[PDB]
Write a protein that binds this ligand. Structure first.
Ligand code: AIQ
Ligand code: AIQ
Ligand code: ZN
Ligand code: ZN
Lengths: 372, 372
């Protein structure tokens, strides 16, 4: 396979279905990427993640640079070898989680200095260092280092962050290109900013296309604006991005949000929602999510979902999983997580099939009627 | 297969190797039984437990009567169906864990009244109720309800508890026999008491043989007496039990203890040691246990054990597992537990092969030289 090749096989309105070919494998789009926090997809062996249908997973750069260390993972042979996942891996830049999870962050034009929420140590993440860490991890899809904008944001603050992010996008591109092995074996995605402002989103898209990237992410959404607002921003933002490259909506996982985002031109998704759902007891079903801990499931012999084809639904009952979760048993988390990730993959498969078959609009309608 | 059939294929000194045939399957002895606390073998799917070579698992009656409930598990179809393990299951009587984990225990000749360490509720466990709960669970090997003796124990207190236990052994036998389905499909094991006193152990064995059971357990050991003392008691106690029936040493799991116990005539074992080892970071190797959390394993690319054939040792490094455990990741517990249980099963296989081949003494010697 080539370093990177995105091909669109079918379309329906703004929706697209196709494939991304990379050295480590093929990624079917629209794609959902399970999240690996500390070099592990919570409570699942990599073989189990693949069994659910996942073609690619996301790796948390912020946690990895802290916990095991980027240089250490490189010395050990890279993230793929370290965790046992040999397919593509998309790594975020670490900038977002720096503002969310770290302490005493000092920002500047060079980058951001911060203290670890673990040992209390200090690090200086910049466009160059972020690109370098992702290289050390052996990432297949590298995310440009940006400055996310807090919601709500004023036009001037949103413009300032967006402009800085574009300057950082150019630095990320140059850093990526100067490293021969990375430029020849991995891909680089640029991230669009501009908050909820159309003119800013347009300026960001133009700057991003001018630099040139393998894919484009719509950043700055799913930050507390609500679905209607998010969809409204997607309506005008996605068409601004190059049509022939992948469109990635960062941090969006709710099933209805995914369906709506695909209808607006999004090709890639990721989310900790499935992995955290099996932490508090939420299991996705075609009839909406259910909290397995509720007393009504104590003697329910039916599987989590009536049509789900995952191993969990083939072998265990709601009653058993209800018991496991309430007992705080590890198997409960393993079972809940596997089902949820499988559910998401089945959702993506149904989306891909309906688009290929010219019946995606009908699918979206049927899905919502039942789910809500 | 028949309800119960123990056959000895080979012997070497006091050591034996053979099989126990039951309706749900064959159990190769000497056997090690992984422990299922709350209807689950900690961090492992039942298919994974079987993959390690386990022929039978132990179910914690005390926890099951509290957490999901005996009557509820029966309404749901039994423990086997509930947790997804279709092979034999040995269930303890619940008497031991009642004295160890419950509050305000009131003992009498009828049984024991106690308060749950969970909700603070109250229950009255007796020989009859214990036998009934194990029936409701659908247990294959039922343990008689006894009164364990605290270490150290005076001759009079040890005699009193032993005598009560024998009266309770008769009540357990009668309760088991009066329930047609249980008597025809399950087996009943009697438990020998008498602390460290030879005459008491002899009186217990005679009373037990007089009543008649499918197997005999040596109870009251591994309660703080030390290996030398435990071995000393086993030296005279095991020969007192019927030769043609299984000998089960309760709550003994250390590898060296298992080897020594087999040399003294023990056929069955169980222990939470493997499951708890992967909780604090202890991994068994043929060169002795290692604490994976230690800094020396941070960049160790070798598997947990150099010759172990488990999937964990085939796919992941010490470095990765070290990271997972220190990060508190669920996958760390899953991986550690699977390896440890596999290690124990490989230990039992090596013991069975060496006995069948008339080289068990040599194996015991070689194992100790390397392990210590
Ligand atoms: N919503 C959102 C989520 C993420 C993290 S990817 C993720 N989120 C949740 C789990 N994983 C984002 N990351 C970056 N770098 N920039 C963004 O604008 C941004 C926006
Ligand atoms: N040592 C020991 C362990 C156990 C529990 S089985 C178990 N122990 C640890 C995990 N599982 C015992 N149980 C009973 N009923 N009677 C005993 O004398 C006794 C002695
Ligand atoms: Zn399922
Ligand atoms: Zn192993």
């Amino acid at each position: 396979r080539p370093r990177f090749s995105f091909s669109i096989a079918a379309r329906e309105g703004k929706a697209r279905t196709g494939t991304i070919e990379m050295k480590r494998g093929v990624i079917r789009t629209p794609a959902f990427m399970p999240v690996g926090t500390a070099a592990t997809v919570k409570a699942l062996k990599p073989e189990t993640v693949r069994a659910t249908g996942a073609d690619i997973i996301l790796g948390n750069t912020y946690h990895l640079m802290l916990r095991p260390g980027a240089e250490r993972i490189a010395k050990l042979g890279g993230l793929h070898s370290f965790m046992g996942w040999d397919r593509p891996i998309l790594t975020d830049s670490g900038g977002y989680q720096v503002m969310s999870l770290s302490s005493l962050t000092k920002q500047s034009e060079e980058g951001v200095t911060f203290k670890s929420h673990l040992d209390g140590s200090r690090h200086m993440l910049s466009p160059e260092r972020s690109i370098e860490i992702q290289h050390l991890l052996g990432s297949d899809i590298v995310m440009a280092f940006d400055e996310c904008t807090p919601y709500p944001a004023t036009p001037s603050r949103a413009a300032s962050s967006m402009e800085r992010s574009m300057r950082w996008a150019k630095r990320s591109r140059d850093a990526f290109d100067s490293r021969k092995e990375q430029a020849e074996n991995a891909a680089l995605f640029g991230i669009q900013q501009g908050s909820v402002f159309e003119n800013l989103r347009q300026q960001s898209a133009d700057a991003l296309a001018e630099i040139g990237f393998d894919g484009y992410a719509v950043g700055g959404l799913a930050v507390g604006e609500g679905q209607d607002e998010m969809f409204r921003v997607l309506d005008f933002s996605v068409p601004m991005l190059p049509d022939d490259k992948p469109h990635y909506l960062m941090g969006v996982g709710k099933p209805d949000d995914i369906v709506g985002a695909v209808e607006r031109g999004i090709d890639m998704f990721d989310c900790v929602l499935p992995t955290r759902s099996g932490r508090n007891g939420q299991a996705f079903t075609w009839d909406g999510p259910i909290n397995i801990r509720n007393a009504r499931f104590s003697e329910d012999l039916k599987p989590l979902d009536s049509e789900c084809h995952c191993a969990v639904c083939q072998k265990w009952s709601r009653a058993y999983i209800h018991h496991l979760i309430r007992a705080g048993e590890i198997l409960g988390a393993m079972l809940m997580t596997e089902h949820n990730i499988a559910f998401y993959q089945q959702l993506m498969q149904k989306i891909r099939d309906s688009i290929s078959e010219g019946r995606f609009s009908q699918f979206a309608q049927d899905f919502r009627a039942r789910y809500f």
